[PDB]
Design a protein around this ligand. Structure first.
Ligand SMILES: CC1=C(C(=O)Nc2cc(Cl)ccc2Cl)[C@H](c2ccco2)C2=C(CCCC2=O)N1
Lengths: 274, 340, 231, 57, 223
């Protein structure tokens, strides 16, 4: 039960920390040379990954003895809030970067003439605020229903009726809407890019788009379908183990696509390693 | 006919080579092998100078040894306060493509000239609040390189039309033209005493020209390709030369022959803007591998590496008093390096 | 270069009036502007200053929170608007220009002046001598004193010397007590150390008598000297 | 032709002017360079670092 | 903590004002498309410049089209070493290369063969390894009348196709594209010009839009 969780958790943490620690350096340098909205949104996507990964060892090193927290009850809400908000912030950040990439090609003159640095900053702050508020709603009720208790496990009867409606609402809003927005924007990207152009453009764009769609599905599909089916069943599902493992895998795979997604990133990466 | 003239020229070249080889009993390395080495140098930069958005050619500090003149491809000439990191003046340029920076000994004039075949003199001490063009010089059919500042009225320039020209500030007319080069002419450092000057062409030839007489007096051929870097060893009896290959050569003036060459097997890229120090111990070379190097101009061995840059270093210069060294590359960044 | 001012006259106490300084012949947008007042018989007194682009605006102690200033680059003019006037505000107002970079000459050019009549920790800078007879051909020394050491931790002193002819606007003579102003004859010179400065006039000629004023620039808040009159 | 003769004569004349130069021994010039270089060694901040207090940065 | 010495406060404020003007100028120039004009000989460069400017150094053209400010630089007036000043033009939006179709018989090796090596040196240049190139096939109307009398066998010894414009022009374009050894990272936009239905400006606009999309894709992640 805990072997499958912890063996993959340690591997993900160990293989992930250096990757994003490295990536932040090139992102900071890119912001230093010249600023662009996509770079700042991607940077916000990265420091969230650090904040999730650097806060991971607080909960990872627990031995899961009965799925209980040996630490006092005041520290579990912090770990739960941060870990749950970091996972849902990725969807909003992906939606924002896909939105920007949509007008990057659909209206190239509009993108080139009018910079959107301040707009990107304010929309990133708005996404942070929305994700934090949605995550806060959940744990501000879990604090008390009235080794002495457990956090994020089987609960009492009073708070389930409060949780499940708003819980499903949060799931729908923060999963389906980013799904539709990103799918529509990338479909129009690969449609416009195919009108009178070369053949390698379609490969290097559509293949990456399909790979990232498959990655997003693999990471956040089982989690959200379990979330939805919990509403019909009524009780909390027991499939909460692997759905978080895929979520952690998401935070680790992003460096890999970061490297070979853009040729400029490869050129910068191959030279600054000293 | 011309066959006898060519044969006479070849015989004269052979005689000159024999005369040069006659006075070559000992080399500089043998004499300098018995002196104390320069040792490790850990010079570091303490400056930012972030005001440009294009490639930088921002040398010729000036006599005051604190002000800087900076020309880039954005069409703006920036006057920098090195001590406090301040921009004194921002002069718009009619042509964005310029490779020239000068500050004049007086400091009231700035010369700019690139591939627009126009040399513009900007007046700094004007009664108004702006900087205006004081004189526009035309007559060159090639891209301008080096706009040295003999006096407040005389300016010598080199272009890509295999010639050099001395112009007057008051009258926009030619005064003295030097036509002895078979290639593009750059690297025209204006002596330590201003009475002479030397220029390095693109045919591996460096020729010295009299300012007053207006005729060539000495030529040096020790390189194997184009030359794009010349200093003048402020002692006044030697000068350094840099070419597109990773090698520098120091040519003596009185001996009229190459003294020694600085090169390494680990460097292959180009060389730009070779300049000396106030004493001559250190010779700083701006290489094209994104960093600069410091060579010992006495023995042979290297002294230090200045790796605080992103793009290829294109310009390098030192103050009159030798307090600090300015280095500029294509990353629109100027770095000022000082000793520990 | 020319600075001409208008808006003078006689005004009852407590009224509001504005002075317009129109600049013609130089870059007004790249030059900070100062307003300086002189009493009919007393010395020169600072009023206010506005930087280029209306970034930093400063007023003297007696005028703080009461006066206002403004600029407009396209029209190339300076306005200073005056509210709640008193009998102590009757003075000739000078609009002057100053530029601030390395090796600059602030207060190099002064305006023409406007006559205004009303009917009914600061550094002090004192001059020991108020009036001394002079002759055309001798050398004369003028001593200036300050309440604080004008030598800051940068290597330069912040002295300024101004000459006012009997009927002409003040003109800068030397700045920072180390450099001669443009268009000023080489006869004038200045020297000294912090808290004790001197100005030497050698080979004095005719058509140069007047009142000398000594200015500090350590802080804002600039105070003139007593003014040395030569005749 | 009739134009290359002038160029050849100009080159020969320039080489003739360059031919008679009172050059001196390379060793003597190197010794003079060493003497000047070591004479101003103490005044060069490049070789001898200045103290941080007196360093103008 | 040092009070900034009063006057240096105004000096640094002037520095900030200069920085503001500098960044305004940089932003203005960032939205300006830069095009480089190249040619072997005449190559119809003057005709293209005269036609598209309205619809001893550089004859710069600053014409506008659909709220886009285009910069054109002609370097045919300089007779010096090319590689010394060829790195100053690196990073341009696109490079325009004009070649005359009526140059496979006239000499001073015919003119088109001499243009092939210039095209190779420009396309294969290290500084131009990421800049798309727009090729113009000028003298289209002269080709119709001067291909019937002069066969194509004089220029290309290995050509055995039909002596028609629709095939000869395609063959010349095919070799011109075959001169590119970096096809995986660069593309060539070939267009024919004539003194009618002047879509050459529209073709330049389309190529500029395509290369802007290409660059923005690199800036915005994907490709
Ligand atoms: C999963 C994922 C992407 C994505 O957003 N995929 C996606 C999501 C939805 Cl909801 C619908 C359709 C799709 Cl294709 C995009 C992406 C797309 C192409 C290249 O990188 C993305 C990454 C991490 C690196 C930065 C980045 O940009 N990883």
């Amino acid at each position: 039960n805990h072997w499958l969780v912890f063996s993959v958790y340690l591997f993900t943490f160990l293989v992930g920390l250096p990757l994003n620690l490295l990536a932040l350096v090139i992102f900071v340098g890119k912001l230093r040379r010249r600023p662009v909205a996509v770079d700042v949104l991607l940077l916000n996507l990265t420091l969230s990954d650090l904040l999730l990964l650097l806060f991971l060892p607080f909960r990872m090193v627990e031995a899961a003895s009965g799925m209980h927290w040996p630490l006092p009850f005041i520290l579990c809400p912090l770990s739960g809030f941060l870990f749950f908000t970091t996972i849902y912030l990725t969807a909003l950040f992906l939606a924002a970067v896909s939105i920007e990439r949509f007008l990057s090609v659909a209206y190239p003159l509009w993108y080139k003439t009018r910079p959107r640095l301040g707009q990107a900053g304010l929309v990133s702050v708005a996404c942070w605020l929305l994700a934090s508020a949605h995550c806060s709603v959940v744990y501000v009720i879990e604090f008390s229903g009235d080794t002495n208790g457990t956090c994020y496990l089987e609960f009492r009867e009073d708070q389930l009726a409060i949780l499940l409606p708003v819980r499903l609402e949060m799931a729908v809003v923060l999963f389906g809407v980013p799904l539709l927005i990103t799918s529509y924007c990338y479909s129009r990207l690969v449609w416009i890019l195919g009108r009178g152009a070369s053949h390698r453009r379609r490969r290097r764009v559509a293949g990456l788009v399909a790979a990232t769609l498959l990655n997003f599905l693999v990471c956040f599909g089982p989690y959200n379908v379990s979330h939805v089916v919990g509403y019909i069943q009524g009780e909390s599902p027991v499939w909460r183990s692997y759905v978080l493992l895929l979520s952690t895998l998401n935070s680790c795979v992003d460096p890999l696509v970061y490297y070979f997604s853009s040729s400029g990133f490869q050129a910068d990466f191959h030279e600054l390693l000293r | 006919e011309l066959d006898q003239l060519r044969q006479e020229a070849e015989q004269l070249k052979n005689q000159i080579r024999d005369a040069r080889k006659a006075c070559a009993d000992a080399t500089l390395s043998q004499i300098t092998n018995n002196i104390d080495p320069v040792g490790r140098i850990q010079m570091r930069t303490r400056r930012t100078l972030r005001g440009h958005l294009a490639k930088i050619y921002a040398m010729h500090w000036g006599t005051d040894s604190r002000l800087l003149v900076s020309a880039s491809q954005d069409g703006k000439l920036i006057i920098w306060d090195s001590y406090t990191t301040n921009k004194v003046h921002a002069i718009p340029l009619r042509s964005s493509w310029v490779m020239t920076c000068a500050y004049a000994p007086s400091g009231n004039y700035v010369a700019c000239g690139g591939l627009d075949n126009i040399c513009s003199i900007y007046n700094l001490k004007t009664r108004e609040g702006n900087v205006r063009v004081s004189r526009e010089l035309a007559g060159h059919t090639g891209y301008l390189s080096c706009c040295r500042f003999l006096d407040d009225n005389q300016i010598v320039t080199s272009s890509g039309d295999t010639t050099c020209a001395l112009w007057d500030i008051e009258t926009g007319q030619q005064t003295t033209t030097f036509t002895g080069h078979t290639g593009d002419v750059m690297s025209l450092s204006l002596a330590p005493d201003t009475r002479l000057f030397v220029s390095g062409a693109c045919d591996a030839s460096a020729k010295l020209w009299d300012v007053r007489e207006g005729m060539c007096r000495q030529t040096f051929t020790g390189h194997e390709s184009d030359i794009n870097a010349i200093c003048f060893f402020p002692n006044g009896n030697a000068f350094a030369t840099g070419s597109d290959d990773a090698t520098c050569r120091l040519f003596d003036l009185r001996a009229d022959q190459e003294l020694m060459t600085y090169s390494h097997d680990n460097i292959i890229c180009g060389i730009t803007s070779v300049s000396f120090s106030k004493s001559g111990r250190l010779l700083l070379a701006g290489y094209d591998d994104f960093n600069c190097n410091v060579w010992d101009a006495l023995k042979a061995d290297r002294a230090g590496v200045l790796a605080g840059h992103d793009n290829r270093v294109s310009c390098l210069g030192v103050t009159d008093d030798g307090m600090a060294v300015a280095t500029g590359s294509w990353d629109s960044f100027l770095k000022i390096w000082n000793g520990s | 270069v020319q600075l001409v001012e208008s808006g003078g006259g006689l005004v009852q106490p407590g009224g509001s009036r504005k002075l317009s300084c129109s600049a013609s012949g130089f870059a007004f947008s790249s030059f900070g502007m100062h307003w300086v007042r002189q009493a009919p018989e007393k010395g020169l007194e600072w009023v206010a200053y506005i930087s280029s682009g209306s970034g930093t605006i400063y007023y003297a102690d007696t005028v703080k929170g009461r006066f206002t200033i403004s600029r407009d680059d396209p029209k190339n003019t300076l306005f200073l608007q005056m509210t709640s006037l008193r009998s102590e505000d009757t003075a000739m107002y000078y609009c002057v220009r100053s530029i601030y970079y390395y090796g600059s000459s602030p207060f190099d050019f002064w305006g023409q002046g406007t006559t205004l009549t009303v009917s009914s920790s600061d550094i002090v800078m004192t001059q020991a001598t108020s009036s001394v007879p002079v002759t055309p051909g001798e050398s004369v020394s003028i001593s200036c004193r300050s309440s604080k050491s004008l030598l800051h931790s940068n290597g330069n002193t912040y002295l300024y010397w101004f000459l006012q002819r009997p009927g002409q606007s003040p003109q800068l003579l030397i700045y920072r007590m180390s450099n001669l102003a443009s268009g000023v004859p080489d006869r004038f010179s200045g020297s000294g150390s912090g808290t004790a400065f001197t100005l030497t006039i050698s080979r004095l000629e005719a058509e140069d008598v007047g009142v000398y004023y000594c200015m500090q620039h350590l802080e804002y808040p600039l105070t003139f000297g007593a003014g040395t009159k030569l005749e | 032709n009739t134009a290359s003769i002038a160029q050849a004569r100009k080159l020969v004349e320039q080489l003739k002017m360059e031919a008679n130069i009172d050059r001196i021994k390379v060793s003597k010039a190197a010794a003079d360079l060493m003497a000047y270089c070591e004479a101003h060694a103490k005044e060069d901040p490049l070789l001898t670092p200045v103290p941080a207090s007196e360093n103008p940065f | 903590g040092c009070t900034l010495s009063a006057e240096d406060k105004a000096a640094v404020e002037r520095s900030k004002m200069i920085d503001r003007n500098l960044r305004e100028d940089g932003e203005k120039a960032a939205r300006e498309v830069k095009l480089l004009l190249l040619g072997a000989g005449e190559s119809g460069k003057s005709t293209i410049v005269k036609q598209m400017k309205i619809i001893t150094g550089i004859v710069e053209t600053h014409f506008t089209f659909k709220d886009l400010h285009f910069k054109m630089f002609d370097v045919g007036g300089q007779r010096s070493e090319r590689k010394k000043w060829i790195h100053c033009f690196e990073g341009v939006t696109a490079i325009i290369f004009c070649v005359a179709l009526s140059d496979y018989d006239l000499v001073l090796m015919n003119r088109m063969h001499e243009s092939m090596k210039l095209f190779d040196s420009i396309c294969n240049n290290k500084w131009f390894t990421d800049t798309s190139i727009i090729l113009f096939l000028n003298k289209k109307d002269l080709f119709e009348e001067k291909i019937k009398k002069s066969p194509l066998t004089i220029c290309y010894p290995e050509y055995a196709g039909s002596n028609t414009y629709e095939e000869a022009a395609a063959y010349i374009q095919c070799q011109f594209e075959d001169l590119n050894k970096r096809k995986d990272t660069k593309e060539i936009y070939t267009h024919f010009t004539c003194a009618t239905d002047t879509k050459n400006v529209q073709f330049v606009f389309d190529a500029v839009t395509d290369v802007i999309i290409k660059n923005n894709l690199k800036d915005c992640g994907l490709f």
